[PDB]
Write a protein that binds this ligand. Sequence first.
Ligand code: HEM
Ligand code: HEM
Ligand code: CYN
Ligand code: CYN
Lengths: 714, 711
Amino acid sequence: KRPKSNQDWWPSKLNLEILDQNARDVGPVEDDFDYAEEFQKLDLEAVKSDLEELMTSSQDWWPADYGHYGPLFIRMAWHSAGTYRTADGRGGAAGGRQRFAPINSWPDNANLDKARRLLLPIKQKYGQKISWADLMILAGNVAIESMGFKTFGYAGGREDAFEEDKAVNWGPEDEFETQERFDEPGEIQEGLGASVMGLIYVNPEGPDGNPDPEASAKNIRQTFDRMAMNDKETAALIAGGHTFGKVHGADDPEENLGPEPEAAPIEQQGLGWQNKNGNSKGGEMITSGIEGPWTQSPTEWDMGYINNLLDYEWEPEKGPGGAWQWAPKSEELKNSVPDAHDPDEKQTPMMLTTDIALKRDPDYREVMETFQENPMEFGMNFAKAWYKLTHLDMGPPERFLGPEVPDEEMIWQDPLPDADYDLIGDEEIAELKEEILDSDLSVSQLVKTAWASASTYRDSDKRGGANGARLRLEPQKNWEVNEPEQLETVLGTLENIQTEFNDSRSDGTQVSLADLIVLGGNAAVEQAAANAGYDVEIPFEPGRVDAGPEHTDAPSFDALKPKVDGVRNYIQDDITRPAEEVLVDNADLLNLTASELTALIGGMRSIGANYQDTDLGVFTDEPETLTNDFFVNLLDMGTEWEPAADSEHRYKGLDRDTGEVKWEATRIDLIFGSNDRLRAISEVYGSADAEKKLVHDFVDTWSKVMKLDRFDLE
Amino acid sequence: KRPKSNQDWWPSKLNLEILDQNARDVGPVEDDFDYAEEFQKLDLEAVKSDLEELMTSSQDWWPADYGHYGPLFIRMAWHSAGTYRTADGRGGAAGGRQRFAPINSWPDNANLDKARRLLLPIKQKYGQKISWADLMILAGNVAIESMGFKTFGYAGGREDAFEEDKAVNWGPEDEFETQERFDEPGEIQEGLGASVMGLIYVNPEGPDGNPDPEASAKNIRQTFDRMAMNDKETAALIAGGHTFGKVHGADDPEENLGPEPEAAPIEQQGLGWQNKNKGGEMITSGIEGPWTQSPTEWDMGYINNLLDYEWEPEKGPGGAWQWAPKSEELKNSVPDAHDPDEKQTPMMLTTDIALKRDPDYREVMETFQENPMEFGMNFAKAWYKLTHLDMGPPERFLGPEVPDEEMIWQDPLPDADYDLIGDEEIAELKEEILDSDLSVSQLVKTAWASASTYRDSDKRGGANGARLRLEPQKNWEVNEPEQLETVLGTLENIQTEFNDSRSDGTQVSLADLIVLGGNAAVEQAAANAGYDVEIPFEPGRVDAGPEHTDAPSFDALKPKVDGVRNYIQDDITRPAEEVLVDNADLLNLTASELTALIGGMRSIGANYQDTDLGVFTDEPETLTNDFFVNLLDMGTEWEPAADSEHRYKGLDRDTGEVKWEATRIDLIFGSNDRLRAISEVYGSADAEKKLVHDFVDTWSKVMKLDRFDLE
Ligand code: HEM
Ligand code: HEM
Ligand SMILES: [C-]#N
Ligand SMILES: [C-]#N
């Protein structure tokens, strides 16, 4: 059978596998592979020409509807980007993970296995020059362009993943197509981007399977908001997308489709949902279980969707696949659309509950009305929304590659300004270092502020980080965890240094507050190491700039607000999961391994950079001195631990003999002495001759985090 | 909550996580870390001195029984080594994995969390110079020596792991202390080293919890045989071990002990089994009492108590089955473990009575009782074997306490009493091999047959020694005996002619010729494809003889499935691809290395019985990426072959004509989501050179796995 899992024996066991994913890159790609460099060698137009030709090259094993695969490719692209969540920046099209379980087998991705398979020859032809991730989005773009609508732009640069993202929690359900995340529409459990397990956003038949358009709109609005889209963008995307193609449900998928890819026979070679006698029979194609086209010309860009939806009355009915769908009352639309496969037959348009939701909901209705009255505005909004949808997880403008990248930078790219001055050199760096350390700022203050600046970075969607010094802007400047009042004091002192440095120059050289924050942190770490007798020189990369409020969507940064911060021993008093689980989730966003996280937390506790300057986990008699005291004292059996009475997050470390309170700590600190694997790391660092190693490892991790958003080396 | 793993949604999904463990080494240790070099700097005597002091240094949180922790440490070491299984070489003491789930929380390891904790100060004092794995065995040895019994030897060199071994299947049960693996004692499901989930070998109360000693003996016999031990070794180890210490069962563990370590509160800091209502009231197994009158002294006390008195079964204070003496001569004959002023009566386990009631064990025990010197030496030798079985060949045994005598279970190798060949001679032999009547396929198949027996679990097997030419390997079905003899015959003639033509004292071994021939053949296959590759070759392998080979012990290395040769035994229970992954793990391969290997190999064509299964190329013996290009071609449709148990047919989608034949070994690379992603890379237009180089790198890595003398 299967070798089982510790997770099965102990469901509550800390999920360190997510951090192990950061210890190596699976797949056959060399260590020195530079995708950006490879994509630069690609003839994008040649790939687009091949995709254009593919659009009308029907393959017998999956005949193209209306002789054009374009709509199928748009759906593939929308589903690829559609899993994105702003909460943690996970999901999305950046790694092409629709190709792996569990996403490749979600019911909502039924038959996209065939869509991706149609693209295999092109992928093989261009090889490493174009990733599956980039290719899936490009196919969607070419499809839209080939059907009469010029796209807003396209950027390459999405490097392919070779496995699923183990850190994504898709929901609490134990079964696909079920929901245990909301009681009332618009009240979905926080952190989730969809209202049902296994679906992209919402149920096409309506909430809980009920054809209730009004209620459907509530979930549509909430899920799209959680995917960074407002009402106008949402309506533009749905209407633009459903302007093309059709839904498939010749019969009930529950009884007519074979196992999803992960459960299918080996001879299926990665495909799934085999149709019982007729996978090539387009006339009996089954995907969602809903049947019918939305418009009269499913392969042409026009106002057909908005017109059919708004200019006619619709009623809920039961389709041939047993699913809820809507049909028009009048016969003005009866057989007004050619059959997707039978040239001698016609079909009547249909609408989904989620489409009717756009007409019933007052706010959405207003948008659709305006679009209908102004087709130009409809196009403008759809083009920009499609570009946003497919590029929002790619990070800053520097990561957007290729000849089709728009000249206009969008706010959702969190753009950084150019430095209109000369960068400081080694001499200046050393001077600023001494000046910051000689200020009224302490080592703890400097470390805390540099961490506050860099710690917002998340590798999921490449947002956040120290470049830009957005820490000094809304909303970060007022986040509780950053201690607003304290932060102001530190920033003012650094700004004064910046001013004095800039005014003392006579050659055009200047320094940004962004660089001073990081440089101050580095100087403070070097100082703490020096206090312990170790001479360390942290590599410093000058060039960070200071971003302004005009180019910062403040509300969008709320998603980067930490609920738990291990370096600062901050635990929001409202979190549901155990603090250490959040700690691991956050560590993943910083691309840390379990060993790096351990060195970081342990080293940090010897410096003492806690929120509100508490002594939680500060197991040392000499604060601001980088040593392995945290581990030596944490592992000492002479101390016994227990939960603090009349407390929520505190534990007391008592002398096992006298009962004298020796230390105080939180679960963040104690997990390193409890979890089997973390304890093995702690034992290494807490050994007699491991101090120097811990110092070097702490410094290496500190430097790594400070540089996470510096793509000036990509 | 926590993300629901793909294995939860699809229980039958391939377990590639085991190969990912070979892709990265978790933990903080340097990439260029050499434990052997570090252990070499250790003052072993100083560590032993510290351990001897520790034996009588009682800690208040786990007070030593009889004022000596020796017996507890022996138990810790026996449990560390005792999970070893010969079937796959997994389990055992070599990585100190008793420290990680699930082993750290098995009921049989109750309170060893305290034993390991007692060793923490010594571990911290010596740091990287001594691993936990080495320290746990050393503590057991020092315990034994301190209590009056000289050990046969000790070797260091076990590198610590930083996580559990995900490839070990511990059994089918879904609950600890239950068994769904035997219907009759002595008939345990194959591949398992214990009769119950969560126990080391057997249930101390008896099979299925019945105090039946005769039946218990059947499970003892089978499980110890699965851990490489015969009747004399088994009896010596049990009697020797139980000459020391006691079993703890002050009350029922089911209701008096807190959660095991993995389930315990964070404040427990890694410990578990917190006693609810500890010393005088220690509860570990739930069985209570000493076996002997002097539990911290080596003597004949266990064998004498067992054989010289009659015992009867009863329920003890912890509610478990144990045996009490029927005579009052043994009443209150032992001092209480925490109070020398009070006394206790000895007890025996159903598994000890098993040694007296089973005819074969009884004969051994009678011999031991009559000859203490025979008992002692059998125990000393078996304890050394037990604790060193998974360390590999003699070259891996480190330190000043390694015995000069090498034992047969170490799979020893003879020294090379001659000068090694150089570049010029290597080239000559290479040419000679290629000029023979041996084909590229015969050469590759033979080298693979030689190198592929290596398993990283216990470091047994591999091409060094040329044991492929000896029993039992020369007769294994997978090795095609008749065909193998033709190849070895030709290489042996080349060896003879070369060795005779020399005068400077230089010689070449058959072990080296087999590998050199394989390398020359791969190079030729690459050249046929237009690529010039030079495979690194390391001379120095020797030819082991039957006297360096315990043949029966090598049957554990016999493959049920061989991916490179597309061999699938017709009796396997698991799907072929699951066995393939299990085997790949033993060769330390990642999913990508396995893919490069199988795909490249199919273009060469080295199949068992020279079949065309998975050989998706029009030009065999030519190293290309044809396997991938053809496997991924949608112009081909696949279906199981009618009336076939392992075959599939690849048909032209627009004709129905058969284009190819294949097994699940071949098709999994085009079915599994992750393997397909790897296959797509190699089947791309500009990936042939990369595949050739990746195949060569993997081939070379496998050829050198047992060369413990490089990196
Ligand atoms: C409230 C959000 C949405 C829901 C519930 C939804 C729903 C559905 C369903 C049930 C299908 C048919 C699957 C099938 O049977 O073949 C489909 C197809 C489609 N969707 Fe949507 N969709 C939504 C949003 C979007 C967006 C945002 C786009 C793109 C900008 C898009 C584009 C398409 C296209 C082009 C097709 C037709 C595929 C084809 O002809 O094969 N959808 N959708
Ligand atoms: C059929 C095989 C064996 C079985 C069923 C068995 C069973 C047990 C049980 C149930 C305990 C008591 C745990 C406790 O309550 O504290 C124990 C203790 C012990 N075992 Fe065995 N055992 C076996 C083999 C061995 C072997 C091979 C050795 C070492 C060569 C060993 C040495 C010890 C020692 C020294 C203790 C005493 C621990 C102490 O005093 O804390 N055992 N065994
Ligand atoms: C939906 N597409
Ligand atoms: C048991 N040992």
